[PDB]
């Protein structure tokens, strides 16, 4: 059974403007495993991105963690872009520290 991905965007540590942090994008619960995940800076693909191994559980289906180093700023800018066969077009989820 096909499952659209669950996407969670958050920082590793509490966000403080001007201080180095890590922007996380956790994608889980999707099937099949073919997926596209990118971290964005005003829609621009961030190129220095790391990611965990593609893992699978019988309960969570497939999951995957992307993360990059970033420095939060006053403005709203950072987001995650996920593309999947269950999506007609790439889905962008903006980062919100109050969320």
């Amino acid at each position: 059974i096909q499952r659209t991905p669950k996407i969670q965007v958050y920082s590793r540590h509490p966000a403080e403007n001007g201080k180095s942090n890590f922007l996380n994008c956790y994608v889980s619960g999707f099937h099949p495993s073919d997926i596209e995940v990118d971290l964005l800076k005003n829609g621009e693909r961030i190129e220095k991105v790391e990611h965990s191994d593609l893992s699978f559980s019988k309960d969570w289906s497939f999951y995957l963690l992307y993360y990059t180093e970033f420095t939060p700023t006053e403005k709203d800018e950072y987001a995650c872009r996920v593309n999947h066969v269950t999506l007609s077009q790439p889905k962008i989820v903006k980062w919100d520290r109050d969320m």
């Epitope: 596209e36 990118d38 005003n42 829609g43 621009e44 693909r45 077009q89 790439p90 962008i92």
Partner: antibody, heavy 116, light 107 residues
Framework: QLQQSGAELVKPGASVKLSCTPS????????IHWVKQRPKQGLEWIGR????????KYDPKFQGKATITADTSSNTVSLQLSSLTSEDTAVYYC????????????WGQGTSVTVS | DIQMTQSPASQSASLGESVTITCLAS??????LAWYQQKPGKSPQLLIY???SLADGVPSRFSGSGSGTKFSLKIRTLQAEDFVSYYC?????????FGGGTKLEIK
Amino acid sequence: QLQQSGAELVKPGASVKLSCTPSGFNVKDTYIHWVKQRPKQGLEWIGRIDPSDGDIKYDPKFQGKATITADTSSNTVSLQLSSLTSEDTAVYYCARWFGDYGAMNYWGQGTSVTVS
Amino acid sequence: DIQMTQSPASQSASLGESVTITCLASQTIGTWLAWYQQKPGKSPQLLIYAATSLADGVPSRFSGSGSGTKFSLKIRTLQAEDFVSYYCQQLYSKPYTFGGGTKLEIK
């Protein structure tokens, strides 16, 4: 709308500065790209600037020739071309980035630069 | 630097016919690909973003397809305004290189 400055006709070896001024939004709101197009030839990506934090990226082959700047006090992004030769004769477009698209959705009319 | 091999370089067709333009990336770029159209006397204009999504105002006879390294631009039922230039562009890794372009000519 992305207003661009008037056409330029200059001698070889001179310098020129093309300006790109948006109407309806601030330069600090998005990325401004610059594209070169020789007469009857294809498109060439030069670089782009984030005027909100001054991040600039260039195509490596344009680093010695082109210099992108921003005057946020005047809501203007500029592209400077120096030591002009015949190969620099082209139309230079400035394009506005749209994050939800992941591409440049609106382009300016372009500034024609003629090197005699 | 990522290379984009756009083919064909030139194509001729008649009104109503269909055309397919292909762009090949030198490495996987996912769906970070845009298609632009350039008409005589105009700036380039966005047709397709994210490989398959139409921009506002673009007619439904324009179709984008592909993922990874091979991408396609399909134009059905060609009218006079469509016989212009088309360029693909990768937005995966800077520099955001363009394709060589394709000029559509009438019969």
